[PDB]
């Protein structure tokens, strides 16, 4: 090798290995593109805390490995997911990452309600933390790029009872129209559009832009317009600058979505159009990306001064009716 032997045996001896430190086998909680995730307690005594233990897909320090590590190694906010430790395994060269174990997420909660409405103090708290976390990420010029209920984790019983944790794991329901009109560049405003869809989803328990499945996606657009209405030139002036604009003009007619709008949609789902909640949702679900409010501005909306105030614990100190994550 021509690499010092003492140095190699010292570091090898002292190196912590995931399988010595953590009990995890049989306790797989998620598959996916970016790895397999296991729910993992510790073998050695000094912990009651579960941890999400994630084996990255593949060998070596890949571009995806490198990025995920790079960022989370720096980020500290109570509403971003936290990286407790990295394990590099020299034998097989697989990279392991530890993350504090969030029992639930918004995909499972909303679904659970959709099997039988979603309590309002909770709804307003959920959004407020989602905003506080995303504002932090945006402040540090870090865009999420793929927000949706499956990526809003919520901590279970423990010292972080009911606190939203933003995460990235690996549909076009939460995508802003400009992305669908082939915008070749992610932005802060694209995230805020996605937070808009969630909020609406929370209030009603249905996805606002629910739809069956290049960057141009026709049927998904038809749904936005069926809900939102077709944008007037005045509403979004630079729609013409979007690369798939003339194709939009080819396949759609403004008149088709005449007399249908977000108020008429939310009215149907028993959300009152003169509520602070609606008036905010509207500012998130703005079609022209540069006319959406920022995350900071939304946090300052009087909706969060309206009774009841959002609580740190999303669950209001109540019993949690949602079930624990199944193994596979």
């Amino acid at each position: 090798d021509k690499m010092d032997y003492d140095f190699k045996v010292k570091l090898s001896s002292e190196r912590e290995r995931v399988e010595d430190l953590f009990e995890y086998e049989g306790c797989k909680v998620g598959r996916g593109t970016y790895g397999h995730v296991y729910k993992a307690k510790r073998k050695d005594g000094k912990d009651d805390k579960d941890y999400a233990l994630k084996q990255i897909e593949g060998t070596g320090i890949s571009m995806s490995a490198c990025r995920e590590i790079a960022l989370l190694r720096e980020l500290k906010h109570p509403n971003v997911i936290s990286l407790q430790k990295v394990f590099l395994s020299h034998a097989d060269r697989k990279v392991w990452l530890l993350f504090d174990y969030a029992e639930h997420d918004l995909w499972h909660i909303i679904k659970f309600h959709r099997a039988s409405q979603l309590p309002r103090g909770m709804v307003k708290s959920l959004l407020y933390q989602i905003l506080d976390g995303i504002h932090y990420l945006h402040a540090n010029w870090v865009l999420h790029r793929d927000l949706k209920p499956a990526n809003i984790l919520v901590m279970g019983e423990g010292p972080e009872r009911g606190r939203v944790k933003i995460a990235d794991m690996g549909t076009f329901w939460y995508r802003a129209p400009e992305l669908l009109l082939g915008a070749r560049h992610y932005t802060k405003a694209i995230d805020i559009w996605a937070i808009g869809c969630i909020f609406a989803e929370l209030l009603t328990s249905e996805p606002i832009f629910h739809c069956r499945q290049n960057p141009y996606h026709h049927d998904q657009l038809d749904r936005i317009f069926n809900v939102m209405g077709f944008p007037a030139d005045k509403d979004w002036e630079d729609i013409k600058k979007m690369p798939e604009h003339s194709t939009l003009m080819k396949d759609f007619r403004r008149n088709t979505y005449t007399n249908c709008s977000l108020i008429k949609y939310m009215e149907k789902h028993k959300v009152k159009p003169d509520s602070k909640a609606f008036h905010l949702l509207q500012k998130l679900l703005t079609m022209d990306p540069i006319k959406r409010i920022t995350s900071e501005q939304a946090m300052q909306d009087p909706y969060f001064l309206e009774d009841p105030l959002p609580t740190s614990d999303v669950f209001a100190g109540c019993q949690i009716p949602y079930p624990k994550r199944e193994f596979l």
Partner: protein
């Protein structure tokens, strides 16, 4: 652009701004084989090796500084015998290029880059061909990533430098020269011992003194410990005297010979 203002809550700042006296203590290890002078000449030599590897591969100067910081940090706490610095140099470029989002440098292209630069630019130090294959780089990378405690994002002086000279309103006169002095600071321990903006101020002071431009009032108006800036000026001014007397090409084969060698297994 990511994490662009997080310095004071950074892993850089909270774990990789080292105390000088701790740094020179764990250095006494290699000082039994190399003298103090020889050791800093080595540091220049590899600062220049990483530079050429950057240049050869077409890479922005920000990627080279990151690479150069990873090389310093490794040998900042470990002996020159532990891993070969000829292996560790391109490995740092390889990792930096990933961390700084320009892409993976290919197996073939990375190894040709090493092979060619030592063959071309550093023929005097290395009469045998670059020996390592890609499996080596991949192995050393893990050892490098573990040693850094996965601290990949690195702040450099070029951003604060820029912001400062734009605030002065003499960007054209000072930026070309100040930027060069900052590159030259990587020949020293400075990136391990001072926040990037300080090194930025330090360099920017020299630039103005070399260019005879008075900026006393502008400097007076800053809320920084000017004692600490004088420390960095001192070191910049000296490295240039180090440059003058150091005859890299005549000396370095002897100095690379003195390096403590790795021990292969029993």
């Amino acid at each position: 652009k990511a994490m662009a203002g997080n310095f004071w809550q950074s892993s850089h700042y909270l774990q990789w701004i080292l105390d000088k006296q701790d740094l020179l203590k764990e250095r006494q290890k290699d000082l039994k084989f190399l003298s103090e002078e020889e050791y800093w000449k080595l540091q220049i030599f590899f600062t220049n090796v990483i530079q050429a590897l950057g240049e050869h591969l077409k890479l922005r100067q920000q990627v080279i500084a990151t690479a150069t910081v990873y090389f310093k940090r490794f040998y900042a706490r470990y002996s020159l015998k532990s891993i070969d610095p000829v292996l560790m140099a391109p490995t740092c470029v390889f990792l930096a290029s990933k961390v700084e989002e320009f892409g993976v440098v290919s197996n073939t292209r990375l190894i040709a880059a090493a092979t060619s630069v030592l063959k071309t630019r550093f023929s005097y130090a290395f009469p045998k061909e670059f020996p390592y294959r890609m499996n080596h780089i991949l192995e050393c990378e893990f050892y490098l990533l573990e040693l850094m405690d996965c601290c990949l994002i690195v702040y450099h002086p070029y951003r604060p430098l820029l912001q400062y000279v734009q605030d002065m309103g003499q960007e054209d006169m000072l930026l070309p020269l100040a930027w060069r002095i900052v590159n030259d600071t990587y020949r020293t321990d400075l990136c391990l011992l001072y926040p990037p903006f300080m090194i930025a101020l330090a360099c920017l002071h020299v630039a103005c003194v070399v260019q005879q431009k008075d900026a006393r009032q502008w400097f007076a108006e800053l809320s920084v410990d000017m004692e600490k800036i004088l420390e960095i000026i001192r070191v910049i001014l000296k490295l240039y005297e180090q440059w003058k007397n150091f005859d890299e090409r005549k000396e370095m084969a002897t100095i690379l010979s003195k390096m403590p060698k790795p021990k292969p297994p029993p």
